[PDB]
Amino acid sequence: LDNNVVECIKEITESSRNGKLVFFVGAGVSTLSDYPQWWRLVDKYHEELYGYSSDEYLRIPQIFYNVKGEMAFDGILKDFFQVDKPTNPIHDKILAMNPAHVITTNYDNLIDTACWKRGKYFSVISAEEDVANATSSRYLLKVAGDFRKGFKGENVVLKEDDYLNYDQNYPLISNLMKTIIATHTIVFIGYGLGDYNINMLLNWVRKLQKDSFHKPFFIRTDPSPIENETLIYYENKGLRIIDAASLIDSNEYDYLERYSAVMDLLIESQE
Amino acid sequence: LDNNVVECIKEITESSRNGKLVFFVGAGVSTLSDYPQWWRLVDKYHEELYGSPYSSDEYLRIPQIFYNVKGEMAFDGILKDFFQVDKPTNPIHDKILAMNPAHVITTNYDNLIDTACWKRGKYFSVISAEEDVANATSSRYLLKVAGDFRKGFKGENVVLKEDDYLNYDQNYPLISNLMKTIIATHTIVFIGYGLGDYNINMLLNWVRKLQKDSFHKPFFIRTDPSPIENETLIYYENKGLRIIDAASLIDSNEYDYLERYSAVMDLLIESQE
Amino acid sequence: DNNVVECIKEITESSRNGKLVFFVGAGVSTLSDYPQWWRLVDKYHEELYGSPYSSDEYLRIPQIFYNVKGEMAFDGILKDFFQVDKPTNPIHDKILAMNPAHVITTNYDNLIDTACWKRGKYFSVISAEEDVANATSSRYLLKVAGDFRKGFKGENVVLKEDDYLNYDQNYPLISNLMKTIIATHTIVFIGYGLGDYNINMLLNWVRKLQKDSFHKPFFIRTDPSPIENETLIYYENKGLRIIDAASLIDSNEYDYLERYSAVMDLLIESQENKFITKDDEVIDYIYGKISPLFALQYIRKIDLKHVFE
Amino acid sequence: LDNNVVECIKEITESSRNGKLVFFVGAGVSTLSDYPQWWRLVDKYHEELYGSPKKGNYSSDEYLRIPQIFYNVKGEMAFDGILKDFFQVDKPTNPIHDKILAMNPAHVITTNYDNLIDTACWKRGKYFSVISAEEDVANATSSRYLLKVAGDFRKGFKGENVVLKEDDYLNYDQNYPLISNLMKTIIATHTIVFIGYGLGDYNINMLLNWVRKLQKDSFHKPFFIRTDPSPIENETLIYYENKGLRIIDAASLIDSNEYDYLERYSAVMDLLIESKDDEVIDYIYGKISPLFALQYIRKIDLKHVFE
Ligand SMILES: NC(=O)c1ccc[n+]([C@@H]2O[C@H](COP(=O)([O-])OP(=O)(O)OC[C@H]3O[C@@H](n4cnc5c(N)ncnc54)[C@H](O)[C@@H]3O)[C@@H](O)[C@H]2O)c1
Ligand SMILES: NC(=O)c1ccc[n+]([C@@H]2O[C@H](COP(=O)([O-])OP(=O)(O)OC[C@H]3O[C@@H](n4cnc5c(N)ncnc54)[C@H](O)[C@@H]3O)[C@@H](O)[C@H]2O)c1
Ligand SMILES: NC(=O)c1ccc[n+]([C@@H]2O[C@H](COP(=O)([O-])OP(=O)(O)OC[C@H]3O[C@@H](n4cnc5c(N)ncnc54)[C@H](O)[C@@H]3O)[C@@H](O)[C@H]2O)c1
Ligand SMILES: NC(=O)c1ccc[n+]([C@@H]2O[C@H](COP(=O)([O-])OP(=O)(O)OC[C@H]3O[C@@H](n4cnc5c(N)ncnc54)[C@H](O)[C@@H]3O)[C@@H](O)[C@H]2O)c1
């Protein structure tokens, strides 16, 4: 173990005990259930266009929409995202932490089904109107939309145009997410350090005063242990990183093992 | 109060019982209990710069002009001498607290609502400064969007000058986000606020940015003597505001402001709890 | 005094080089007896509440009327006031006599355009978004508050609250052009109130600029009473150089053309040799004019007339 | 040649003859002079940081961040030292710079921090006021600007007076308010022709995003000279042509080799710089029609009319 790791685990458990822990779950948690990873859809759109760079993830969907209409866009999106994948152990592991809120950029319903299975009831907030009608005290925030109003591309923010207008298209959802981040303890699971959402959140946290907020915990479970340079870089940007690969030596492709190891370490520390 | 008022009271009481009620207490309420209204301070500031003495832009500029010209020290001096006189909490404060509001949002810097909250036994975690937002110890917040003098009687703690309002969104990101979230997720009742108030109008613009029927239109208690002109009422109602007119509610003289406030407060409290 | 003398010197030096831009306010239009805004605001208030301000009220009352009585009523009430024509006053002639590089005006009238046509200098007028892209001439008459050229509707002009709220979004090209002209050219404000909405917005934008990276605009104040010193410091530290017409000449408050005429006569008449009285400044001026000619072996005697203008 | 390129050339030459042509010179023109490509700088930064060069290509986010990570991790001094090592060299100006200058553009907008464009302008005896810093906008020394929107190395080879890292681009609108607004004004009031830029470039993406906010059919679509190795796809062409661009594909016209960029640039450039008994009467009438407004015309003035 490590003194930094033990301190982070203790802080996480302490915040979970008093109901302050909030889980920011990325696509890494949803790929455990073998849900279509975004590069699958990007590659399908690219192949449709002409028979992965980060900017391409937003460009390819954008060009495909602009050319093949909302018609082809929603057609492909519904085709690839109607699988009904089963929830992985990590979903229930996240739920066992008893998080106050679960912010997920994912559009798949794995997380809410996991909450229902555990019995925890989270008011799902994935649309502008959902904020006003949120009855439950605990919010499950889908800050990228979800396929519960249908399988149209308007529901989600997959393409680059939605990302560009997200601030003015999701003012209530955006400000609620910022409030949750500011007033809670945030743990990032299933997110790459280069993710668009992670970088945008890090840019936002710059505007905050030096000691105004709490540095969110980042749980990295990529196969390759991070370089010291990246750890130092993202430590000064407000991210507190716990490296699954560094914590335990494991197989490169055994992402499930890394996620589960970090999660059971947290749970066992919480008792 | 046939329809446009009875329905407002019914919705307010329903939200209060549900617990999704928040009060945006204006400066006027803190003036019901004798207190220095900001126009008096603006007059004093102008008299310091000039011989004798108001537009809202002048409201923001005259203290700003004093701060720029005279300096931080003198500005803080008049601020402290004028705003350091303790005052007794009026019946309006405990009347507001009796509704059991979830949170209390106010643009006042005085300790006249926290005192009422403590005296009534209800604990609201006061959030007046930037750093107080994250280190919150209670579910319910008494958010002073304009700051307060708890840390000290310096003018930097509060936003009252033109520059303070110019950089408010940059100066108070967390506080502004928290207030916006509270407004969006709770039913908001505005009390002791000028219909053309600066803070009210900025929030009205923010709500205009919001999409159609994506939020609940806040309530606004209007307490100055003159009954609301129909055109102004229509304009503000279409601006996402539901106006409860204290002047139309009862019959009273212009200068008896306590009676006009109490009419609305009692009609809201006693009527179906 | 030295301050006003230096202000006039800078203004004239910028004008002679073609780097002078004039920010014409509503006072210049009022000098031509054009209907001031407060008249129309009073008309709107009377129509709204039956029987009849501030920066907020000026924007609100027209805004209230727009959505309470409708677009057509707003357009009709504003056209019945602004459709009347007026003759350009001597102040427009004085403004154009400086050969300004550009004229930026928030007025919705055509008096400045008519004066530009009179003088013979073709100022391509930009009062709409499409105007910026297709403006053949290099001299811009920027109507930053719209114009009635297209029609007499209220949409073409910026005079109501929502119009000002979405100005940056509604007029991106026009705002960018005005800011570029302000940053590049020397700016003189005439016909504007010190506590004005447009001037305050320009000051707010200038605050964002890096220190000493821009030139402080000149503001010609024609208010009836001499400006308070405290306000003078406040506005000169905000990025303004104030030339007070009331201070230069004492005139009765009711009349305003005399103050504008005094300021503009000081501008036009002023010459670099007008201020040189010390015999140590005579040599300074002569050397400033003759020094670059030292690089030439011989200078034609008759050609020297060009050196001394 | 094709008809679309014919229309584009017609409009570009017309605008240039009116003194309304501006050239947005990209990094490809500088690379034509064998100037250190930014990808090589990013590779050096990555090698210094992680001890080995990155496997594969670099994304735009990588270009923006690897320099930023090195700057805040390895310190400012090393960040400027790498820039001094790679950029302090002086490279000859390629024929493309002189070709661009031969069009006598009203202004020259370039994100390059090198002085190659300035050297070409002087070699052609052109007086361009180089506005590379914030203070330069107010004190312009000439009518036509060589506006370097990404800064330049005139005031030393420090990385502060350049837009290279992620923070420089993030705070550009606040770091360069005057320069950004002047560039936008020049774009709005002039005819812009892009050279040496890729469709995936960050600067072009930002400019296209800004052009979104403009009013419908308010601005003029800027021309974009595309000279990437491969021919332009029919999907990206439509995508970027309704995004405000006027793409002119070099590979589409010239059936040239790959990695032979110089001639590919030159084809478009010299197709740009090289410019019946029923049209003769039309031309003469076009020249003489305004003269009908005058009672009498001097014959020598007629010589004047016919250039
Ligand atoms: N990025 C691409 O376009 C691309 C193309 C081919 C393969 N990949 C694969 O994706 C990974 C990196 O990029 P990405 O955006 O697709 O993922 P990422 O690593 O960028 O994605 C986010 C999260 O994904 C998790 N993850 C990645 N692969 C996983 C797996 N097999 N099982 C469980 N979790 C997994 C990591 O936990 C990471 O935090 C690499 O593992 C790579 O082999 C990516
Ligand atoms: N110099 C001035 O601006 C001026 C002119 C006339 C009256 N006043 C006094 O200032 C306020 C004028 O109305 P106003 O809306 O500008 O107020 P205000 O806007 O200055 O602030 C107070 C708000 O609270 C309520 N309020 C009004 N008068 C009050 C009073 N005397 N005691 C307690 N609460 C009051 C009103 O709803 C008012 O909007 C009153 O207090 C009035 O007696 C001031
Ligand atoms: N304050 C009001 O809203 C209101 C209402 C009715 C009438 N008025 C009259 O108008 C004047 C205020 O004018 P404003 O709204 O333009 O604010 P203003 O007085 O601030 O505008 C000032 C610019 O307009 C100029 N100006 C004022 N009167 C002028 C005149 N007769 N001729 C030429 N220029 C003049 C001054 O030049 C000044 O620099 C008041 O002093 C009053 O006489 C004002
Ligand atoms: N991603 C990388 O950095 C990487 C790695 C290895 C090789 N390369 C090669 O280096 C090139 C650098 O371009 P970029 O990817 O940095 O942007 P890019 O290739 O999109 O930029 C190309 C634009 O710049 C110009 N350009 C590119 N390469 C040129 C060349 N070799 N000669 C003349 N002009 C050229 C072209 O006009 C083109 O439109 C790549 O296009 C590729 O050929 C790049």
Coordinates of C-alpha atoms in Angstrom, one line a residue, chain D residues 48-280:
Chain D
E48 CA 11.7 14.6 -22.8
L49 CA 8.7 13.9 -20.6
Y50 CA 8.0 10.2 -20.8
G51 CA 11.4 9.2 -22.0
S52 CA 10.4 7.8 -25.4
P53 CA 8.5 9.1 -28.5
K54 CA 4.8 8.5 -28.7
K55 CA 3.7 5.4 -30.6
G56 CA 1.8 6.6 -33.7
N57 CA 0.4 10.0 -34.5
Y58 CA -0.5 12.9 -32.1
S59 CA -4.1 14.2 -31.7
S60 CA -4.8 17.9 -31.5
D61 CA -5.4 17.5 -27.8
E62 CA -2.0 15.9 -27.6
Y63 CA -0.4 18.9 -29.4
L64 CA -2.1 21.2 -27.0
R65 CA -1.4 19.3 -23.8
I66 CA 2.0 17.6 -24.1
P67 CA 3.6 21.1 -24.4
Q68 CA 1.4 22.2 -21.4
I69 CA 2.3 19.2 -19.3
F70 CA 6.0 19.7 -20.0
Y71 CA 5.7 23.5 -19.3
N72 CA 4.0 23.0 -15.9
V73 CA 6.0 19.9 -15.0
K74 CA 9.5 20.5 -16.5
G75 CA 9.3 24.3 -15.9
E76 CA 9.1 27.3 -18.1
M77 CA 12.8 27.5 -18.6
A78 CA 13.0 24.1 -20.4
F79 CA 9.9 24.9 -22.4
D80 CA 11.5 28.0 -23.8
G81 CA 14.8 26.2 -24.2
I82 CA 13.2 23.6 -26.5
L83 CA 11.6 26.4 -28.5
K84 CA 15.0 28.2 -28.8
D85 CA 16.7 24.9 -29.9
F86 CA 14.1 24.1 -32.6
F87 CA 13.1 27.6 -33.8
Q88 CA 16.2 29.7 -33.5
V89 CA 17.3 28.4 -36.9
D90 CA 16.7 30.6 -39.9
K91 CA 15.2 28.9 -43.0
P92 CA 15.0 30.1 -46.6
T93 CA 11.7 31.3 -47.9
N94 CA 10.0 28.9 -50.3
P95 CA 8.5 30.0 -53.6
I96 CA 5.0 29.9 -52.0
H97 CA 5.7 33.0 -49.9
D98 CA 6.7 35.1 -52.9
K99 CA 3.8 33.7 -54.9
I100 CA 1.4 34.8 -52.1
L101 CA 3.1 38.3 -52.0
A102 CA 2.7 38.5 -55.8
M103 CA -1.0 38.9 -55.2
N104 CA -0.5 42.1 -53.2
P105 CA -3.0 41.2 -50.5
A106 CA -4.5 43.9 -48.4
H107 CA -3.4 42.1 -45.2
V108 CA -1.6 38.8 -44.4
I109 CA -3.0 36.8 -41.5
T110 CA -0.8 34.0 -40.3
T111 CA -0.6 31.8 -37.2
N112 CA 3.1 31.0 -37.9
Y113 CA 5.5 32.4 -35.4
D114 CA 8.4 32.4 -37.9
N115 CA 9.6 35.4 -39.8
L116 CA 9.5 33.8 -43.2
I117 CA 6.5 35.8 -44.3
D118 CA 8.2 39.0 -43.2
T119 CA 11.4 38.1 -45.0
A120 CA 9.3 37.3 -48.2
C121 CA 7.5 40.7 -47.9
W122 CA 10.8 42.5 -47.6
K123 CA 12.3 40.5 -50.5
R124 CA 9.4 41.8 -52.5
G125 CA 9.9 45.3 -51.1
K126 CA 6.5 45.4 -49.3
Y127 CA 6.0 47.4 -46.2
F128 CA 3.8 45.3 -43.9
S129 CA 3.0 46.4 -40.3
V130 CA 3.6 43.2 -38.3
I131 CA 1.1 43.0 -35.5
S132 CA 2.2 40.1 -33.4
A133 CA 1.6 41.4 -29.9
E134 CA -1.2 43.2 -28.1
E135 CA 0.4 46.6 -28.1
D136 CA 1.1 46.5 -31.8
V137 CA -2.5 47.0 -32.8
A138 CA -2.8 50.5 -31.5
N139 CA 0.6 51.6 -32.9
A140 CA 0.3 50.4 -36.5
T141 CA 3.1 51.7 -38.7
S142 CA 1.4 50.9 -42.1
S143 CA -1.9 50.5 -43.7
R144 CA -1.6 46.8 -44.4
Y145 CA -0.9 44.5 -41.5
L146 CA 1.0 41.2 -41.3
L147 CA -1.1 40.0 -38.4
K148 CA 0.4 37.0 -36.6
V149 CA -2.5 35.8 -34.5
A150 CA -0.3 33.1 -32.8
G151 CA 2.4 35.6 -31.8
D152 CA 6.0 35.5 -32.9
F153 CA 9.6 35.4 -31.6
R154 CA 10.6 39.0 -32.3
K155 CA 10.8 39.8 -28.5
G156 CA 13.0 36.8 -27.7
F157 CA 12.3 33.1 -28.1
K158 CA 10.3 32.8 -24.9
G159 CA 7.1 30.8 -25.1
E160 CA 5.1 33.6 -23.5
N161 CA 4.7 35.6 -26.7
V162 CA 3.3 32.6 -28.6
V163 CA 0.2 30.5 -28.6
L164 CA 1.6 26.9 -28.3
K165 CA 0.3 25.2 -25.1
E166 CA -3.2 24.3 -24.0
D167 CA -3.4 27.3 -21.6
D168 CA -2.3 29.7 -24.4
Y169 CA -5.2 28.6 -26.6
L170 CA -7.7 28.4 -23.7
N171 CA -7.1 32.0 -22.6
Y172 CA -6.4 33.3 -26.1
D173 CA -9.7 35.3 -26.3
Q174 CA -8.7 37.1 -23.0
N175 CA -4.9 37.1 -23.8
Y176 CA -5.4 38.6 -27.3
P177 CA -8.6 40.5 -27.3
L178 CA -7.5 43.3 -29.6
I179 CA -5.6 40.9 -32.0
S180 CA -8.5 38.4 -32.1
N181 CA -11.1 41.1 -32.7
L182 CA -8.9 42.7 -35.4
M183 CA -8.5 39.4 -37.1
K184 CA -12.2 38.8 -37.0
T185 CA -12.9 42.3 -38.4
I186 CA -10.4 41.7 -41.3
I187 CA -12.1 38.3 -42.0
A188 CA -15.5 40.0 -42.0
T189 CA -14.5 43.0 -44.2
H190 CA -12.2 41.2 -46.6
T191 CA -11.9 38.1 -48.9
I192 CA -9.9 35.5 -47.0
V193 CA -7.9 32.7 -48.8
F194 CA -6.5 30.0 -46.6
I195 CA -3.2 28.4 -47.4
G196 CA -1.1 25.7 -45.5
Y197 CA -4.0 24.8 -43.2
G198 CA -5.6 21.4 -42.6
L199 CA -9.3 20.9 -42.1
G200 CA -8.5 19.5 -38.7
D201 CA -6.4 22.4 -37.6
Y202 CA -7.4 23.9 -34.2
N203 CA -7.3 27.5 -35.5
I204 CA -9.6 26.7 -38.4
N205 CA -11.9 24.9 -36.1
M206 CA -12.1 27.9 -33.8
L207 CA -12.7 30.3 -36.8
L208 CA -15.5 28.0 -38.1
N209 CA -17.1 27.9 -34.7
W210 CA -17.0 31.7 -34.5
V211 CA -18.5 32.0 -38.0
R212 CA -21.4 30.0 -36.7
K213 CA -22.6 32.9 -34.6
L214 CA -22.7 35.2 -37.6
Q215 CA -26.0 36.1 -39.2
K216 CA -27.2 34.0 -42.1
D217 CA -25.6 35.1 -45.4
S218 CA -24.1 38.1 -43.6
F219 CA -20.4 37.4 -44.1
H220 CA -18.5 36.1 -47.2
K221 CA -17.4 32.5 -47.4
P222 CA -13.6 32.4 -47.1
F223 CA -11.7 30.3 -49.7
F224 CA -9.6 27.5 -48.4
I225 CA -6.8 26.0 -50.4
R226 CA -6.6 22.3 -49.6
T227 CA -3.3 20.5 -50.5
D228 CA -3.3 17.4 -48.3
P229 CA -1.7 14.3 -49.9
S230 CA -5.0 12.6 -50.6
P231 CA -7.9 13.7 -52.7
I232 CA -10.8 15.4 -50.9
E233 CA -13.7 13.2 -50.0
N234 CA -17.1 14.1 -51.2
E235 CA -18.5 14.0 -47.6
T236 CA -16.0 16.3 -45.9
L237 CA -16.3 18.6 -48.9
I238 CA -20.0 19.1 -48.3
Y239 CA -19.6 19.2 -44.6
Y240 CA -17.1 22.0 -44.7
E241 CA -18.7 23.9 -47.6
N242 CA -21.9 24.5 -45.7
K243 CA -19.8 25.4 -42.7
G244 CA -18.7 28.6 -44.4
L245 CA -15.7 27.4 -46.4
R246 CA -15.0 27.6 -50.1
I247 CA -12.6 24.6 -50.4
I248 CA -10.4 24.5 -53.5
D249 CA -8.7 21.1 -53.7
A250 CA -5.2 21.0 -55.1
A251 CA -5.2 17.2 -55.4
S252 CA -8.5 17.3 -57.2
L253 CA -7.1 19.5 -60.0
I254 CA -3.5 18.4 -60.3
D255 CA -2.9 14.7 -60.6
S256 CA 0.4 15.0 -58.8
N257 CA 2.4 12.8 -56.5
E258 CA 2.1 12.3 -52.7
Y259 CA 4.5 14.0 -50.4
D260 CA 5.4 16.4 -53.3
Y261 CA 3.6 19.3 -51.6
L262 CA 5.6 22.1 -53.1
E263 CA 4.3 21.6 -56.7
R264 CA 0.8 21.0 -55.3
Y265 CA 0.8 24.4 -53.6
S266 CA 2.4 26.0 -56.7
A267 CA -0.4 24.6 -59.0
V268 CA -3.1 26.4 -57.1
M269 CA -0.9 29.5 -56.5
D270 CA 0.0 30.0 -60.2
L271 CA -3.6 29.1 -61.2
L272 CA -4.4 32.1 -58.9
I273 CA -1.5 34.4 -59.9
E274 CA -1.6 33.8 -63.7
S275 CA -4.7 36.0 -64.2
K276 CA -15.5 36.4 -80.3
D277 CA -16.5 39.7 -81.9
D278 CA -19.5 39.5 -79.6
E279 CA -17.6 40.1 -76.3
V280 CA -15.4 42.8 -77.9

